[PDB]
Amino acid sequence: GARASVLSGGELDKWEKIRLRPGGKKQYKLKHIVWASRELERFAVNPGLLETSEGCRQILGQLQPSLQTGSEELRSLYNTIAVLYCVHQRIDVKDTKEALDKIEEEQNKSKKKAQQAAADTGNNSQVSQNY
């Protein structure tokens, strides 16, 4: 994967400063971005969007609701992209854990604007209990 860089000289240094795990000590590497960039192309999405914070925000917004039935490929993508998006918004995370949660807080304020469907719902969906 080498169609076009995604992170800048500055973001690159901050990208390698992001830990993959909460307790682990393994930082992030291009292998993680390059992989996603070559993945989006398979999801009918151009890798030229990852270069812009707006592109990611839009990509994640699609996988978010797909997390329910998203194969491993979807998981790795969301997690990875999540860490990248944070960088584009000049946000420094402690790990792939605090990064995923951080994106939930910044989006929470947005969901409040479109929380008309969540409430006053009238459609009993299938209920499960298998963890």
UniProtKB/Swiss-Prot annotation:
First and last residue of the signal peptide: none
Modification after translation: Tyrosine phosphorylated presumably in the virion by a host kinase. Phosphorylation is apparently not a major regulator of membrane association.
Protein's membrane topology: Lipid-anchor
Outcome reported for the amino acid change (mutating S76A): Loss of ability to fuse with target cell membranes and infect host cell
Spans annotated as Interaction with membrane phosphatidylinositol 4,5-bisphosphate and RNA: 13-32
Region Disordered: start-end pairs: 105-127
Modification Phosphotyrosine, positions: Y131
Annotated segments matching region Interaction with host CALM1: 7-42
Role description: Targets the polyprotein to the plasma membrane via a multipartite membrane-binding signal, that includes its myristoylated N-terminus. Matrix protein is part of the pre-integration complex. Implicated in the release from host cell mediated by Vpu. Binds to RNA.
Record text on subunit structure and interactions: Homotrimer; further assembles as hexamers of trimers. Matrix protein p17: Interacts with gp41 (via C-terminus). Interacts with host CALM1; this interaction induces a conformational change in the Matrix protein, triggering exposure of the myristate group. Interacts with host AP3D1; this interaction allows the polyprotein trafficking to multivesicular bodies during virus assembly. Part of the pre-integration complex (PIC) which is composed of viral genome, matrix protein, Vpr and integrase.
UniProt protein name: Matrix protein p17
Gene source species: Human immunodeficiency virus type 1 group M subtype B (isolate NY5) (HIV-1)
Annotated gene: gag-pol
Residues of the full protein shown: 2 to 132 of 1435
